[PDB]
Amino acid sequence: GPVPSRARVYTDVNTHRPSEYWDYESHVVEWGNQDDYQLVRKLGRGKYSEVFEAINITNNEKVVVKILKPVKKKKIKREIKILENLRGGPNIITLADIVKDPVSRTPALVFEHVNNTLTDYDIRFYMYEILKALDYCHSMGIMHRDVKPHNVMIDHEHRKLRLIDWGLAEFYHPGQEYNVRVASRYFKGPELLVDYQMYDYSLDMWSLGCMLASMIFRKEPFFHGHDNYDQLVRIAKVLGTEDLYDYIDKYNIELDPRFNDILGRHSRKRWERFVHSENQHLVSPEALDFLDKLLRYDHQSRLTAREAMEHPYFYTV
Amino acid sequence: SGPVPSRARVYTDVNTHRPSEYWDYESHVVEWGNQDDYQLVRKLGRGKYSEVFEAINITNNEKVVVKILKPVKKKKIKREIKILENLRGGPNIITLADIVKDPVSRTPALVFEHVNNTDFKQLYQTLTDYDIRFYMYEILKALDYCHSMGIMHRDVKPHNVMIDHEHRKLRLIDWGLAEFYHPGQEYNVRVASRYFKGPELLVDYQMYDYSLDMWSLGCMLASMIFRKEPFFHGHDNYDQLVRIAKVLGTEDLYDYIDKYNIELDPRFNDILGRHSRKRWERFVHSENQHLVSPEALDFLDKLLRYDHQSRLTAREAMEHPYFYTVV
Numbered sequence: 001g002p003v004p005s006r007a008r009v010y011t012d013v014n015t016h017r018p019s020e021y022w023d024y025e026s027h028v029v030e031w032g033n034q035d036d037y038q039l040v041r042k043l044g045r046g047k048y049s050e051v052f053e054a055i056n057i058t059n060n061e062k063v064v065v066k067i068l069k070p071v072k073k074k075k076i077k078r079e080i081k082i083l084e085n086l087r088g089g090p091n092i093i094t095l096a097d098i099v100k101d102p103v104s105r106t107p108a109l110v111f112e113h114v115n116n117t118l119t120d121y122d123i124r125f126y127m128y129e130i131l132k133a134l135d136y137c138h139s140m141g142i143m144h145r146d147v148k149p150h151n152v153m154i155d156h157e158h159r160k161l162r163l164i165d166w167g168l169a170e171f172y173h174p175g176q177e178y179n180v181r182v183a184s185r186y187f188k189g190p191e192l193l194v195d196y197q198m199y200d201y202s203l204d205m206w207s208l209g210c211m212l213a214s215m216i217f218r219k220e221p222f223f224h225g226h227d228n229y230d231q232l233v234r235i236a237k238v239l240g241t242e243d244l245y246d247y248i249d250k251y252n253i254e255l256d257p258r259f260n261d262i263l264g265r266h267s268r269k270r271w272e273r274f275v276h277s278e279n280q281h282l283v284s285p286e287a288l289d290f291l292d293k294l295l296r297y298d299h300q301s302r303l304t305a306r307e308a309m310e311h312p313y314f315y316t317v
Numbered sequence: 318s319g320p321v322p323s324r325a326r327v328y329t330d331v332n333t334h335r336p337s338e339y340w341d342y343e344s345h346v347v348e349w350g351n352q353d354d355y356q357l358v359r360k361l362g363r364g365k366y367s368e369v370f371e372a373i374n375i376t377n378n379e380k381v382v383v384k385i386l387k388p389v390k391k392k393k394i395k396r397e398i399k400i401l402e403n404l405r406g407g408p409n410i411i412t413l414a415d416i417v418k419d420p421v422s423r424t425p426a427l428v429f430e431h432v433n434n435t436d437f438k439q440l441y442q443t444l445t446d447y448d449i450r451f452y453m454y455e456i457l458k459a460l461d462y463c464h465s466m467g468i469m470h471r472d473v474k475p476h477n478v479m480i481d482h483e484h485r486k487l488r489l490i491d492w493g494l495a496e497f498y499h500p501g502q503e504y505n506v507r508v509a510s511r512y513f514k515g516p517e518l519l520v521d522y523q524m525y526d527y528s529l530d531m532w533s534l535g536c537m538l539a540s541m542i543f544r545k546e547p548f549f550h551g552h553d554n555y556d557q558l559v560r561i562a563k564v565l566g567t568e569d570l571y572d573y574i575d576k577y578n579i580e581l582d583p584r585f586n587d588i589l590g591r592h593s594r595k596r597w598e599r600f601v602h603s604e605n606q607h608l609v610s611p612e613a614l615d616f617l618d619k620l621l622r623y624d625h626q627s628r629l630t631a632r633e634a635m636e637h638p639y640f641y642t643v644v
């Protein structure tokens with residue numbers, strides 16, 4: 001079978017905490033009355049959720065209400081426990097309340113309102129704001145597992161950032177085998193794509209690297225896969241096939257036969273080739289060195305959030 | 318021309334503004350699962366038309382509580398289930414987990430979350446002023462929630478409050494007497510347990526509301542802070558009003574009946590007498606002085622009022638100085 005792996009940072013943070021912290025299945029959720037919130041308008045719709053702008057009638061404050069389609073109760077307990085553990089943390093969305101409408105009885109989460117609205121400095125600034133949230137949640141023993149631009153809200157007028165949608169987040173336990181059907185296709189780490197289950201917080205750093213590459217190069221998404229197998233091929237077209245085989249061999253990973261006719265052979269490309277007239281004002285040696293240190297096949301060889309915060313790319317923030 | 322009408326000062330029209338599916342429990346369709354998934358372990362207690370068992374959910378090896386109902390009134394079972402379903406998941410409300418029937422007996426059974434009830438007597442000896450403020454606040458969270466949901470419990474008493482002291486967890490149980498509040502509705506006064514019956518029930522004033530629960534909570538608070546169980550020890554429902562009048566006085570009882578044009582039952586004529594209004598300080602003794610304070614007495618005085626409209630609502634009670642020391 002596959003070779004075991006563990007996180008280089010915050011490895012045992014949950015092991016040293018009582019089970020009440022991480023045993024979300026045993027968490028008792030107490031649903032308040034949704035009558036204290038008046039729904040104003042529909043903001044958007046997700047896979048098993050509808051998001052509304054609302055007003056808290058007790059204090060006249062605008063909030064956001066996420067009405068969840070309860071397809072999996074254990075998953076709702078997980079998201080609430082994680083939101084409660086992280087409540088008030090730097091750049092983490094604030095869970096304000098947990099309520100149910102008296103008639104429908106549909107689970108609803110109430111969040112702080114974010115008025116969601118670039119230069120080389122703006123990218124360094126906001127990348128540092130995301131790192132504050134990631135180093136915090138990793139220190140809290142939590143992997144987000146769905147880092148992407150849609151899950152990052154920015155109020156640019158107030159230079160405020162929030163990391164949202166904790167629905168795929170999980171608690172990190174060393175040696176635990178996790179479900180690889182996480183994150184969104186363009187941001188899926190190589191470990192998920194090859195079915196390597198013993199992954200960690202480093203999955204989030206790969207996704208952050210995909211975001212940085214798209215911003216500095218103005219190429220959205222950076223790795224444009226059309227399916228999960230193809231997604232690995234798009235990565236291999238940049239990182240090369242030699243280092244992919246070194247990765248699978250290091251961890252004794254069995255490659256799925258679906259990769260046989262599509263993977264091919266690819267050279268490792270240099271980051272400088274993605275620089276063009278339209279993006280050169282956002283690119284620098286420091287930006288490329290930092291990106292190269294995030295986008296690595298081997299999950300263990302990527303910068304941790306703490307390490308990334310010490311990179312020369314952030315000397316100006 | 319009869320009694321003066323009355324309505325709740327809070328959550329008055331919460332059911333009026335909801336579709337009938339919410340409160341029309343007679344029309345609620347109950348689906349009963351297979352009780353075979355639960356193995357009964359031991360009998361916990363027995364009530365009037367119910368037997369309570371500790372049981373084990375065989376699908377997950379978790380302890381649960383099974384309440385087997387003697388189906389003497391089907392409408393009442395529908396009422397209890399609809400209320401439990403409406404309140405499910407609310408703060409400190411017992412959680413209805415399942416509704417089942419044994420394949421052979423076909424007897425209605427409700428499955429609840431398990432509460433590890435610490436023995437009260439052991440707790441009673443060691444209870445502190447802080448613990449009483451803490452647990453009283455926990456009951457108020459449950460009452461403000463159920464009143465906001467348009468429901469009166471109508472059977473608030475210590476036997477219906479389960480506390481796991483080790484985990485500082487409290488649950489309000491036995492929703493069998495609970496009812497939906499509709500303004501102007503005349504309710505049956507034969508509810509609540511004798512010692513906890515509000516004056517409205519005792520004088521046969523039918524148009525009562527959520528404030529009935531606040532009187533019963535006041536009876537519990539008085540028994541805890543003064544270590545006098547029960548506080549108002551009536552021997553029958555008429556004598557129960559006399560016990561209250563021996564504390565609250567007869568002057569304010571006549572003001573209450575006059576405000577609502579209530580006709581006092583002739584059975585009170587030879588037993589009520591005349592009684593002065595007592596100071597709450599008179600119930601303080603060496604055995605209970607560590608649980609009493611000016612704030613505790615001011616709060617008690619504001620719950621134990623004849624006039625149901627004059628009592629603090631649950632939300633008002635939560636703002637009282639007595640709770641300044643609780644989170």
Ligand SMILES: CCc1ccccc1-c1ccc(CNCCc2nc3cc(Cl)c(Cl)cc3[nH]2)cc1Cl
Pocket residue numbers: 361362369434437444448449452453456475476477478479480537538541
């Ligand atoms: C500090 C607590 C307090 C403050 C103010 C007023 C009263 C009390 C109080 C005093 C005692 C109790 C304990 N009630 C337990 C009743 C009970 N235990 C049960 C155990 C079982 Cl198994 C069953 Cl079936 C029913 C049960 N009902 C609850 C309470 Cl809430």
